[PDB]
Subunit: 252 residues, 2 copies
Amino acid sequence: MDERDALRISREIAGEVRKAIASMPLRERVKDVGMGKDGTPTKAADRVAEDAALEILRKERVTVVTEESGVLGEGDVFVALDPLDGTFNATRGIPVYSVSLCFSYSDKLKDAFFGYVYNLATGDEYYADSSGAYRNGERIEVSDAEELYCNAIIYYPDRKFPFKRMRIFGSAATELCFFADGSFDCFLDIRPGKMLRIYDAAAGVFIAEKAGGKVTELDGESLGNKKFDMQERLNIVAANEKLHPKLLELIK
Amino acid sequence: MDERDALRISREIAGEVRKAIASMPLRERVKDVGMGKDGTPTKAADRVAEDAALEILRKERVTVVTEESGVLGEGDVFVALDPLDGTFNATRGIPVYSVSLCFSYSDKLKDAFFGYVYNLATGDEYYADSSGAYRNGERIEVSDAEELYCNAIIYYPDRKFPFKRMRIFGSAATELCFFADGSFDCFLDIRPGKMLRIYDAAAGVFIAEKAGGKVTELDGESLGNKKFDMQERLNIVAANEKLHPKLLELIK
């Protein structure tokens, strides 16, 4: 498989996933249907979403990692999948939630060749391959935000901070694409618990990097060897080249 | 003018403003045209929305209160208007932005008789009146959660909090409706630098209260004396009756 195929498959899935959820009323959406492999409630909206995506990835030779079902298949191309990133918003009808797809030629983040995040409430399509990163077919780049006095997305502000704005929308994949296109100056998940997961973050991170952002763990080190399995966890500091060090500086 | 005239007027307004913004590209929305009564810039999105609103409004016997154009007119129904709350979101295609209107029978919030918040992105309509609070014409009520381990919108977390989730979406009027809804268990604007202005607070305050919430100043003071005219900005502590007393202690 290659980048154009991943892009064709991802679009297949988003189209099918968006119709599975769009026609499901909030009342149906919010009901628990099971417990995820990941340990949290599977909501009905997650499993309808998760089901439309699996019927596509099934016909392809891959190893998929997902929240509800977990590790699946035995293909050489690994897929980190969040069929529904922003479930809480979806169940509440808040228009910020996405499908997120990251494909890798190995079990580790550093071998990623495609990343895709599709917001299912707006039709906004974000992706990245070798030719760069795009929003709805258009080239995107991080901001040239060199001041600390900037627009941050952060999980979770814990103290006084110097940001012009602070936002938290409930969809990490999607907010990583808000960083990537330059609509926010940085993204931070510095929760000491290290609560962000690999299917949640991998499409976003890769996309953010293709758009020029620097994307590291808490301490500035590379995420390159993050594993596409259920037990991986991460923290994230992401901003352009000049701003990134100041941020690391800030939180240290 | 009565609560029924107020719904009719709000709806036509929602229509014009929805029409105009929907027609302009992001690159346009974001231009500074640009100086309003607070010293914050007026973006092209802001002006177009205001113009559409005001055109409809001051055909009425009203005093308009807006940040952009300040206090307009001399009629004695007072209308707190913000034609586009969530401007930063709107200019980047992030779909949480609304037109907000609160009609009172004096310049004081306590004489409020109608509140109206329309999601310009999604078409969600919230309103309240002496009959009750609605979302897309279905009556609503606030959650009844009683613990601080709840779902909170909060401008801004500065210390360690016990909440189950914290969110910050960039449109206080919409966000007070998320609370009004039960979607979120509380709404907190505790910023030491009380920045919230009455025209962004009044309607969602109005709707949340008709939906059963307790909504007061930061120390628990009543909001009925806050005025549609000027200089003072709000702090807000919004929650069901059982959680509100607890929130007041916590932000001690």
